[PDB]
């Protein structure tokens, strides 16, 4: 709201360990294969399944409530297996959002309730708008905005994304405290 990030008070129940905060409400079925190296946030009722995964997330990663990050299955003639996805640094997944994406780049703002397709690659410094469908096996270049049910080039982003996005994710993390 007018550049400034607003207050969000968390409850007592949340798994805070080595900077990484993960809501107890949010199930993450397969805790072994999933890894959170940095000071990540995972909001309540969110899913990070371990269906033969290697879900590596960023330094300041944010996943809002009711949102799912599942790896896609690669339809290979040699052997059909689930491809391990790698969420980049400073990644912001918005609320109620579906992600079946392989290799999500750093410094990205994925919009609200937007379905990303199977085996979908996202390069760094991009932005997917809200109520948008990226089809299976699609690529989005840097400094781009993809939107619509087709999921196609809408326009370009501001030049200063790399520097700006840092402030957003770090401010949200700092502003997001217990009550």
């Amino acid at each position: 709201m007018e550049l400034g990030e607003l207050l969000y008070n968390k409850s007592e129940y949340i798994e805070t360990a080595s900077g990484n905060k993960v809501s107890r409400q949010s199930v993450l079925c397969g805790s072994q294969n999933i890894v959170l190296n940095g000071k990540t946030i995972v909001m309540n009722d969110c899913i990070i399944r371990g269906d033969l995964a290697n879900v590596r997330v960023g330094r300041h990663c944010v996943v809002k409530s009711r949102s799912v990050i599942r790896p896609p299955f690669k339809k290979f003639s040699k052997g059909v297996a689930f491809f391990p996805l790698h969420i980049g640094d400073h990644v912001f997944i918005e609320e109620d959002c579906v992600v079946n994406a392989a290799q999500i780049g750093s410094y990205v703002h994925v919009g609200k309730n937007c379905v990303i397709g199977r085996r979908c690659v996202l390069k760094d410094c991009c932005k997917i708008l809200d109520n948008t469908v990226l089809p299976p096996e699609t690529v989005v270049p840097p400094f781009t905005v993809f939107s619509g049910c087709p999921g196609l080039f809408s326009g370009e982003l501001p030049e200063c994304t790399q520097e700006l996005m840092i402030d957003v994710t770090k401010s949200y993390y700092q502003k997001f405290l217990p009550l």
Binding site: M1, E2, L3, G4, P135, P136, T138, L152, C160, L164
Partner: protein
């Protein structure tokens, strides 16, 4: 940029045309002392690239190829980057289930090299008219 409403508080530019824009969009000019907008500044062309198969093409090759990638294709029904599927290759979309078999294009033995667009029907008549007017203009 969008999550925080950068499109609220705006900075003004000095010159002929006055514009109200967010600081995120604006650029500072160091040669002189006056910040200028994306509108005010002149735009150039550096490099061309495909959004699917990210391959930096030179300016000369683009003019020959009509600003297009040879390997990658976009579906006609919906506007999305197609994918090569085998059984010996057919072109299919992920969003809509439009195939290359539907319109009746034959499957190619080689993956990329085989696929092509038919020649323009009035291409021979075109060159004859240019050469006539070229001689007449001379």
């Amino acid at each position: 940029a969008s999550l925080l409403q950068s499109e609220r508080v705006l900075y003004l530019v000095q010159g002929e045309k006055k514009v109200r824009a967010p600081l995120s969009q604006l650029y500072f000019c160091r040669y002189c002392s006056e910040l200028r907008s994306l509108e005010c500044v002149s735009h150039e062309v550096d490099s061309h690239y495909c959004p699917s198969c990210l391959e930096n093409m030179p300016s000369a090759e683009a003019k020959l190829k009509k600003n297009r990638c040879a390997n990658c294709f976009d579906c006609p029904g919906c506007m999305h980057t197609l994918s090569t599927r085998a059984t010996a290759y057919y072109l299919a979309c992920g969003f809509c289930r439009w195939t290359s078999r539907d319109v009746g294009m034959a499957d190619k033995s080689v993956a990329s090299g085989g696929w092509q667009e038919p020649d323009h029907p009035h291409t021979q008549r075109m060159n004859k008219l240019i050469e006539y007017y070229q001689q007449l203009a001379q």
